[PDB]
Amino acid sequence: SKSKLPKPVQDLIKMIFDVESMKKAMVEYEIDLQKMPLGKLSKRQIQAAYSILSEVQQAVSQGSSDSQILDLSNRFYTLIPHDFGMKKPPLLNNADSVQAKVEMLDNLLDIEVAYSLLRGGSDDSSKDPIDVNYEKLKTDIKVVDRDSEEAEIIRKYVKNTHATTHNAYDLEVIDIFKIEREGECQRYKPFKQLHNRRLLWHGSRTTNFAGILSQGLRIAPPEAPVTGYMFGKGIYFADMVSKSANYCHTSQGDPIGLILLGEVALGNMYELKHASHISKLPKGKHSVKGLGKTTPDPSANISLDGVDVPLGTGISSGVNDTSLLYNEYIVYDIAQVNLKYLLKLKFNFKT
């Protein structure tokens, strides 16, 4: 049977469940697909690699020499087989190297979720595989009409918050989907009337979306080192579309990406200017706000279904001596997020 879902929804389902895209992410990470194919990836293997990556960063912080670092770095490559032929693998000594591996493991965890959905469950050739994969997401997905009110506001948010420092590309909104993850509205109930509820961006690689729609935005596992995240292990958002769009990791070889709009209950924000690898918030705080030098103009904030949308053009925030060019918002309880929209974007690279 043929799917009756709208063509943009079918194309969205096709992109997020693409096995060749999952394999392409694993080749980007120099993973040996003979020793670690897509089907042999498992949570316990990724969690054990996160634990070794914590032992690696623990020694870097404790001023250990390259002789001691070598043994811990080699251990990481044992757990996550990389394809280096008969050469020694790149030494994980610097912070930029260890940071990249924590981020690789974050993507691998979501890839394992997506592939587990495709491989678990049933096979029925009489149904359209698009319809079958759609149901695995347990998310109602509707197309938002271009000439509707919510679409005008969303397109204005995209139009106004593209940073001048991210000028290597411009964005075109292809499709706007209104999404409703089953059980999420009920989970959000304790926070639905909290103050400082804002509609914020969350960008991610396309290969992470089957996991985000099936399980919602999650916090990194306990094995993951708290130092591998600027503000510790939470759920990150931005008010500048391009800061979030950069996390799609699109390129001229793959210029289409996906970005989320989520209602986030920020409440009492813990304001910070530099990295703070916290395990828990201070008492009475509900989120972290990383203070950027630039913020969408606060006077241009508008309300969409009771939620504040900071869609104003970027202006100076008045914040001096901060590590951040733009704001970032972090929550440490998954129940503080209610996903609202999912956009498909075309990145027009100007380089």
Numbering used by the authors: 661 to 1011
Please share excerpts from the published article on this structure.
The catalytic domain of PARP1 includes a helical domain followed by the prototypical ART domain. Structurally, the helical domain is placed adjacent to the NAD+/ligand-binding site and limits its exposure to solvent. The crystal structure of apo-PARP1 catalytic domain shows that the ligand-binding site is largely preformed, and the inhibitors can be accommodated with minimal structural rearrangement. The second difference is in the nature of the donor loop (D-loop); in PARP1, it is longer and more rigid than in TNKS1. PARP1 D-loop has three proline residues in its sequence, which likely contribute to its rigidity. In addition, interaction with the helical domain might make the D-loop structurally constrained. In all structures reported here, a structural water molecule is observed (except for the olaparib-bound structures, where it is displaced by the carbonyl oxygen of the ligand; see later). This water molecule makes hydrogen bonding interactions with the imidazole sidechain of the catalytic His862 and the backbone amide nitrogen of Tyr896 in PARP1 and analogously with His1184 and Tyr1213 of TNKS1.
Poly(ADP-ribosyl) polymerases (PARPs) are a subgroup of four enzymes (PARP1, PARP2, PARP5a, and PARP5b; PARP5a and PARP5b are also known as tankyrase1 [TNKS1] and tankyrase2 [TNKS2], respectively) that continue the reaction (PARylation) to generate long chains of linear and branched poly-ADP-ribose (PAR) on target proteins. PARP1 is involved in repairing single-stranded DNA breaks making its inhibition an attractive strategy in oncology especially in those cancers that have defects in additional repair pathways. Thus, TNKS activity promotes Wnt/β-catenin pathway, and TNKSs are potential drug targets for the treatment of cancers driven by Wnt/β-catenin pathway, most notably colorectal cancers. We determined crystal structures of the catalytic domain of PARP1 and the ART domain of TNKS1 in the absence and the presence of the ligands.
